[PDB]
């Protein structure tokens, strides 16, 4: 249930707009390789899987404080969001670091499995843990399912969490929880495969509406707005054959209005 | 705050049955896994069975699977272990332990134990250290760095205490003098500014799978005293 | 039954949910969600697959609040559904064969099948076989008395999805000539290198009403959900392959309907 | 500026058109539309691309009929646009490596980027780099004082597309936080074997009005068109690769708008 929603406030001061860029968290193996992950290991048996922290991309998130409008109670209601991945043309650099596609050719473009996801809500994004291999020892500095069992590889209802920390929740361990998130709208698409091509579209004319069937958007509890993202673009193949995840930042522009509640 | 009381241990004829009880108080019982650990007289600790928060998942060590049945009553804050077809190899003090710190089944709070009489990881047997010096206790196994390690301290005639969980993390109330590391094929516990109280038996535990919670044999650390 | 007016008044609507585990074969206790490794090149005359190698349809029966003690039935109106755990395929460091020397592990890919159904009766199925001479193992329910026409259309191969982890996906499909009280949706994509493509959002809803505006009417206050979500093949370091499946979520909104 | 009513009348509307040439690098006098051949495997610490290797954004300022000397501005309402010469890639007999012995030439394929913008101000752009230590050559305009932050988001890397054949595509994207007076559309598709997919038709129109019904308002009677149409890589017989680009057509309808 939550709160009982009343009328929408009108007036020139009844609308506000917030924007932000959300950095990607791919692992950052050293101070020069911001936006990349550590090179990927392979063929570790399920019984001895223990990835390094700098190899694991994580969800990005930020809490945006909104103007205090109570100064009947009011809440900021998120109505629309414009969002976009920043820096897609940087993958047209094929002269740096990447393995040549063949003798005398250019570098190999970033390609492979990718995941593009964003969420807007008045609460932190609620997440459900699912694991490829429950026996994985995840490293210090990450937050992954507690007390994992073999059912963590399908559905273990004890693996609930709030996306409440940045660069902490590995993407491979968590997904948005459809059984919750009453105060959040989320959108994501996964495409896996060695040769999956990145496909990214930019325009400042597209808007996603955040209202539900009753015309209510996410209501910002404690005057805070939550943005979340994960934009793994694919793998970068170095000249030696090693591979690293590559991520890019995401822009948000959210329009909000004042809404009466009881 | 937290209190655990085991009961039910007595003498049992081989092939007989016995039911152990553990009364829990001082914490939210239904929020944590519960574990049974046994220790034969003069030997080390052995993981026997554990159970999920709501009892919907139960796991057993091979030697007792089919004979033992673990259960819990969250309305009464009680944990149970039903032992059938008891063999002489089952003779041990049985501990009741909570699963609070970390992700990989470390054992935080232990009870006083109850005695039942029926009738992989390499540790050095002994280590000596001078007071104020620094002592190292090692736990060895194949690719132990790939698995999480927990370290426990047990003073003679007392219940085990968790000093390190998930390789390097120290619980609240444990001094920074105790330190743990895990890499390669050896995990090491380091005790610094050694004190008289630090002298005890020290155990390493590894979580490899749902039924595999191996313990090490243990090391006696002796502080040179008089 | 003859459908009358929709009842109104707060207590007239209800909303139920459940997570439905996949039944991929589960070769051992640690590999829940996977199948046994796949055999190959067995002649049609000696095709004899093991049970743990065969993915099966998932199904469950969700109890609804009792209505009768003026007959009423629960009518499913909408469903929100989603495949759970799609990002776990971003683990390329465990178990999977390297794409090349010094590279990362090979992603899960290949043939996949994604299917769900919501109805007031058990999903009704029709059997079709790749090879009618296949000897299906103990524990599975497959077409009885198969013949060569089982490979195209044998109308005797009718079944209800009335048991979980028992009807192999490769043997059965939703029966379009029946299922008057069920809505089903499925998409098959086949091939070695087929990339998995999975979308998640809590903003999409499927309406379950038919042309007359009637949704599934729940017999005996029982709502049926069914699913099959084979995501592709996992390639181990040695080259062996296993199916990988994922669980599916349901949130169904229902209302009280008068019937005569 | 405060937007008032739309002017009506036969003379209240105007229409402009232009062809915008691509800026791929032009390595010599004969290879207009191509780039210099690509180098590969230069370490991030010593990345130093030549200018003729870097495709750049195209832009042009179109003068409009003077309106003033109660103010009026030209308002861009619609745009028809398409890529020019898409069928030239059906030349497989010239220069391109054979697909196999006795076969025809390899088609242009690979990573591609197609983008256009219309506004009353120069396009506002944001700098993002694959490698921040890259030494960009004389004659290009690239992010000033790059740091590792420039590989994700460095808010200091702001620029106007105010010079043609100067801003390398691999360095700059349209800035979503600005461009209040410009509409931009772009699509990137990367990968070695990405097939070019290009549609042409004179019946398709993009509306340039915002949610308020206002189009880009042309400051100083000037309209700005921008484009980047990298089609893919051309593979020569020796195995070397060059970008190939094509020009873009614009037809923009405008109308007179009152402003205060």
Q: How many CB atoms sit inside 10 A of residue A97's CB?
A: 24
Q: A156: distance to nearest CA of chain B, Å?
A: 11
* CB-based contact D220:D159 (threshold 8 Å): no
C29 vs B contacts (CB less than 8 Å): 210
**How does DSSP assign chain D, residue by residue?**
--EEEEP-SGGGEEEEEEEE--BS---SSS-TTB-PPPP--B-GGG----GGG--B-EEEEEE-------EEEEEEEEEEEEES-GGGGG--SSSBPBSSTT--BPPPBS-EEEEEEEESSPPEEEE--S-TT--PPTT----SS--GGGGT--TT-EEE--STTTSBTTTEEE-TTS-TTEEEEEEEE-STTPPP-----SS--EE---TTS---B-GGGEEEEEEEEEEEEEEBTTS-EEEEE--EEEEEEEEEEEE-
Q: List chain A residues with CB under 8 Å of D53.
A: 95
Burial letters C202-221, b for 16+ CB under 10 A, else e: beeeeebeeeeeebbbbbeb
CB of D156 less than 8 A from some CB of A: no
Nearest to C202 among A42, A153, A178 (CB): A178
Of A130, A191, A193, the CB nearest to C84: A130
Whether residues D47 and A103 touch (CB distance < 8 A) is answered with no
C30 contact residues in B (CB cutoff 8 A): 209-210
Answer whether B52 sits within 8 Å of A147, measured CB to CB: yes
Burial class of residue A224 (count of CB atoms within 10 Å of its CB; 0-12, 13-18, 19+): middle
Contact A111, A196 (CB under 8 A): yes
Interchain CB distance below 8 Å, B103 and A150: no
Nearest to C107 among A113, A134, A184 (CB): A113
Structure-token pair, residue A110? 């970033």
- Beta-bridge mates of residue C140: none
Residue D176 and residue A92: Cβ atoms within 8 Å? no
Q: Which of C94, D131, D132 is nearest to A110 (CA)?
A: D131
Is A198 in the D-facing interface, judged by CB distances under 8 Å?
A: yes
Per DSSP, B194 falls in state: -
For C200, the closest chain A residue by CA position comes to A188
Q: How far is CA D31 from CA D28, D35, D84, D114, D243, in A?
A: 6, 8, 17, 21, 11
Chain B contacts of A148, Cβ < 8 Å?
A: 103
Among the listed residues A146, A159, A169, A140, the one whose alpha carbon sits nearest the alpha carbon of residue A229 = A169
Distance CA A137, CA A46 (A): 10
Distance CA(A202)–CA(D183), nearest Å, equals: 11
Nearest-CA distance D240 → chain A (Å):
5
CB C110, CB C233: distance < 8 Å = yes
Do chains D and C have 3 or more beta-carbon pairs under 8 angstroms? no
CA-nearest residue to A213 within chain C is: C203
Phi, psi of C221, rounded to the nearest 5 degrees = 50, 45
Cα D175 to Cα D163: distance, rounded to the nearest angstrom: 17
SS (H, E, C) D183-203: EEEEEEECCCCCCCCCCCCCC
CA distance C141 to C161: 10
Compute φ and ψ for C39, nearest 5 degrees.
-85, 165
- For residue B210, which residues of chain C lie inside 8 Å, CB to CB? 29-30
Q: State the Cα–Cα distance between residues C164 and C20, nearest whole angstrom.
A: 10
Tell me the C-alpha distance between A41 and A59, whole Å: 21
Count the Cβ atoms, other than its own, within 10 Å of residue D13: 16
User: Considering CB atoms only, which of C17, C82, C94 is closest to A46?
Assistant: C94
Provide the residue count of chain A.
Answer: 262
Q: How many Å apart are CA C46 and CA A187, to the nearest integer?
A: 47
Chain D residues closer than 8 Å to A247 by CB: 152
Residue C89 in contact with residue C196, Cβ under 8 Å? yes
- Using the Cβ of C198 and the Cβ atoms of chain A, whether some distance falls under 8 Å is answered with yes
Are A20 and A64 contacting, i.e. CB atoms less than 8 angstroms apart?
Answer: yes
Q: How many residues does chain C have?
A: 260
Report the distance separating Cα A51 and Cα A139, nearest Å: 7
Subunits close to D (at least 3 CB pairs below 8 A): A
Please state, as a whole number, how many other Cβ atoms lie within 10 Å of the Cβ of residue B177. 15
Interface mutation target, options A135, A150, A159, A161, chain B, most CBs of B under 10 Å: A135
**Angle C161-C132-C183 (CA atoms, 0-180°, nearest 5)?**
25
Q: Do D40 and A94 touch (CB under 8 A)?
A: yes
On chain A, the residues whose CB falls within 8 A of the CB of C237 are 42-43
SS3 of chain A: the string is: CCCCEEEECCCHHHEEEEEEEECCECCCCCCCCCCECCCCCCCECHHHCCCCHHHCCECEEEEEECCCCCCCCEEEEEEEEEEEEECHHHHHCCCECECECCCCCCECCCECCEEEEEEEECCCCEEEECCCCCCCCCCCCCCCCCCCCHHHHCCCCCCEEECCCCCCCEHHHEEECCCCCCCEEEEEEEECCCCCCCEEEEECCCCEECCCCCCCCCECHHHEEEEEEEEEEEEEEECCCCEEEEECEEEEEEEEEEEEEC
Quote the CA–CA distance of C47 and C131 in Å, as a whole number.
8
The terminus-to-terminus CA distance of chain D in angstroms comes to 6
φ, ψ of residue D219 to 5 degrees: the values are: -65, 135
Q: Which helix (H) or strand (E) holds B71?
A: strand B68-73
Cα–Cα distance, B97 to B79 (Å, whole number)? 10
What letter does residue B122 receive in the DSSP assignment? Answer: B
- Distance of alpha carbon A191 from alpha carbon A235, whole angstroms: 13
User: Chain C 93-122, CB below 8 Å of chain A: which residues?
Assistant: 93-109
The 3-class SS string of chain C reads CCEEEECCCCCCEEEEEEEECCECCCCCCCCCCECCCCCCCCCHHHCCCCHHHCCECEEEEEECCCCCCCEEEEEEEEEEEEECCHHHHHCCCECECECCCCCCECCCECCEEEEEEEECCCCEEEECCCCCCCCCCCCCCCCCCCCHHHHCCCCCCEEECCCCCCCECCCEEECCCCCCCEEEEEEEECCCCCCCEEEEECCCCEECCCCCCCCCECHHHEEEEEEEEEEEEEEECCCCEEEEECCEEEEEEEEEEEEC
Sign of CA dihedral B81, B84, B89, B92: positive
Q: Which residue has the tokens 């361990």?
A: A173
Q: What share of chain B is helix, strand, coil (3-state, %, to 5)?
A: 5, 45, 45
Mutate to test the interface with B, among C19, C21, C29 (most CBs of B within 10 A): C29
Q: Which subunits sit against B, judged by 3+ Cβ pairs under 8 A?
A: A, C
CB-CB: which of A49, A50, A146 is closest to B103? A146
Q: Which residues of B touch A138 (CB under 8 A)?
A: 103
Candidates D45, D192, D235, partner chain A, best to mutate (most A CBs within 10 A): D192
Quote the CA–CA distance of C178 and C123 in Å, as a whole number.
9
**Which residues touch C155 (CB under 8 Å, ≥6 apart)?**
none
Q: Token pair for residue B111?
A: 């009870």
Closest CA–CA distance from residue A116 to any residue of chain D (Å): 14
- Please answer yes or no on whether C93 and A44 come within 8 Å at the CB atom: yes
- Any chains having at least 3 CB pairs less than 8 A from chain A are B, C, D
From the CA of A51, how many Å to the nearest CA of chain B?
9
Give residues with Cβ within 8 angstroms of C86, minimum separation 6: A175, A188, A190, C196, C198, C200, C246
Per the rule left: phi > 0, alpha: psi between -120 and 50, beta: everything else, D252 is beta
DSSP-derived secondary structure for B41-58 = TTS-EEEEEEE-TTSS-E
Q: Nearest-CA distance from C125 to chain B in Å?
A: 32
Q: State how far the Cα of C85 lies from the Cα of C107, in Å rounded to an integer.
A: 15
D69 to chain A, minimum CA–CA distance in Å? 34
With the CA atoms of A112, A118, A123 and A129 taken in that order, what torsion angle do they form, in degrees rounded to the nearest 10?
Answer: -20
Handedness of CA C169, C121, A179, B29 (dihedral sign): negative
DSSP H helical segments within B99-173, as ranges?
Answer: none
**CB within 8 Å: D176 and A91:** no
Pairing of strands A243-247, A224-237: antiparallel
DSSP 8-state symbol, B151: E
Residue C189's nearest CA partner among A191, A29, A154, A233 is A191
A32 touches chain D (CB under 8 A): yes
d(C-alpha D94, C-alpha D111), whole Å: 21
Dihedrals φ, ψ of B74, to 5°?
A: -65, -20
């Amino acid at each position: 249930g939550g709160v009982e929603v009343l009328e929408v406030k009108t007036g020139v001061d009844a609308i506000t707009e917030v924007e932000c860029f959300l950095n990607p968290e791919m692992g950052d193996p050293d101070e020069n390789l911001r936006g990349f992950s550590l090179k990927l290991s392979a063929e570790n048996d399920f019984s001895s899987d223990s990835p390094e922290r700098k190899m694991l991309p994580c969800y990005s998130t930020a809490r945006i404080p909104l103007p205090n409008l109570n100064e009947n109670l009011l809440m900021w209601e998120a109505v629309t969001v414009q969002t976009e991945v920043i820096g897609i043309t940087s993958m047209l650099n094929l002269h740096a670091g990447s393995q040549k596609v063949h003798e005398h050719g250019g570098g190999k473009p970033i390609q492979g499995s990718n995941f593009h996801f964003f969420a807007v809500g008045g609460d932190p994004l609620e997440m459900q843990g699912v694991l490829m291999n429950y026996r994985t020892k995840y490293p210090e500095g990450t937050i992954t399912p507690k007390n994992p069992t073999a059912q963590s590889q399908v559905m273990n209802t004890d693996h609930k969490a709030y996306l409440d920390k940045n660069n902490a929740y590995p993407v491979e361990c968590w997904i948005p929880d459809p059984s919750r998130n009453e105060n959040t709208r989320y959108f994501g698409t996964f495409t896996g495969g060695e040769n999956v091509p990145p496909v990214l579209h930019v325009t400042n004319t597209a808007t996603t509406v955040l209202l539900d069937e009753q015309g209510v958007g996410p209501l910002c509890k404690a005057d805070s707005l939550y943005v979340s993202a994960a934009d793994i673009c694919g793998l970068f193949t170095n000249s030696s054959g090693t591979q690293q995840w590559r991520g890019l930042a995401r822009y948000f522009k959210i329009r909000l209005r004042k809404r009466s509640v009881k | 705050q937290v209190q655990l009381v085991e009961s039910g241990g007595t003498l049992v004829q081989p092939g007989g049955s016995l039911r152990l009880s553990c009364a829990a108080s001082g914490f939210t019982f239904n929020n944590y896994w519960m574990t049974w650990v046994r220790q034969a007289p003069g030997k080390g600790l052995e993981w026997v069975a554990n159970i999920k928060k709501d009892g919907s998942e139960k796991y057993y060590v091979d030697s007792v699977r089919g004979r033992f049945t673990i259960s819990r009553d969250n309305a009464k804050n009680s944990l149970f272990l039903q032992m059938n077809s008891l063999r002489p190899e089952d003779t041990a003090v049985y501990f009741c332990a909570t699963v609070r710190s970390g992700r990989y089944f470390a054992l935080d709070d232990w009870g006083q134990g109850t005695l039942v009489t029926v009738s992989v990881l390499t540790q050095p047997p002994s280590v000596s250290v001078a007071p104020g010096k620094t002592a190292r206790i090692t736990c060895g196994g194949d690719n132990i760095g790939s698995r999480p390690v927990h370290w426990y301290q047990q003073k003679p005639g007392q219940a085990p205490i968790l000093v390190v969980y998930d390789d390097s993390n120290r619980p609240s109330g444990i001094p920074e003098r105790f330190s743990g590391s895990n890499s390669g094929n050896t995990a090491t516990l380091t005790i610094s500014r050694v004190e008289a109280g630090d002298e005890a038996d020290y155990y390493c535990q590894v979580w490899s799978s749902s039924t595999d919670h191996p313990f090490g044999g243990g090391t006696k650390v002796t502080v040179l005293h008089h």
